[PDB]
Design a protein around this ligand. Structure first.
Ligand code: HEC
Length: 124
């Protein structure tokens, strides 16, 4: 919401190596065909670790979603900044790591990509 969606659309290039945003009709809104990560379409407000077509979720992600994690900005930003650190605290498991552990470099990108998802990845 307070980030720059247009700056986020551009910062999304960092994520398209592994994600894609493809609406229910099947149109690619961002990215080409990366499957490593889950389709980010409809992630806003979605319960962590529940994208129907994804099969590579780590246990930490499936459990955080089971403990009640649905994506909002606050969380989404903490997560991409340090994904392990976030899964350990949310999950309470000091042994959770996740399938992606790189830490985002800028916090602004995080807010901007969120403002962009809020503009293109919200499942009506
Ligand atoms: C590949 C090297 C990745 C890059 C680059 C990015 N993401 Fe990612 N993401 C990846 C994986 C394998 C997973 C699964 C994590 C696991 O432990 O299971 C994810 C997950 C996410 C999620 C969770 C979505 C869900 O369905 O609950 C989000 C919110 C997410 N990724 C965001 C994201 C953003 C914004 C990126 C660019 C800055 C990005 N990812 C890059 C793998 C990879």
């Amino acid at each position: 919401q307070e980030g720059d969606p247009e700056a986020g659309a551009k910062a999304f290039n960092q994520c398209q190596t592994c994600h894609v945003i493809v609406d229910d009709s099947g149109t690619t809104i961002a990215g080409r065909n990366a499957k490593t990560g889950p389709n980010l379409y409809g992630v806003v407000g979605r319960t962590a670790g529940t994208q129907a077509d994804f099969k590579g979720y780590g246990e930490g992600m499936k459990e955080a979603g089971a403990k009640g994690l649905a994506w909002d900005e606050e969380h989404f930003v903490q997560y991409v900044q340090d994904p392990t650190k976030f899964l350990k605290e949310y999950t309470g498991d000091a042994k959770a790591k996740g399938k992606m552990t790189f830490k985002l470099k800028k916090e602004a990108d995080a807010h901007n990509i969120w403002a962009y998802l809020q503009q293109v990845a919200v499942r009506p």
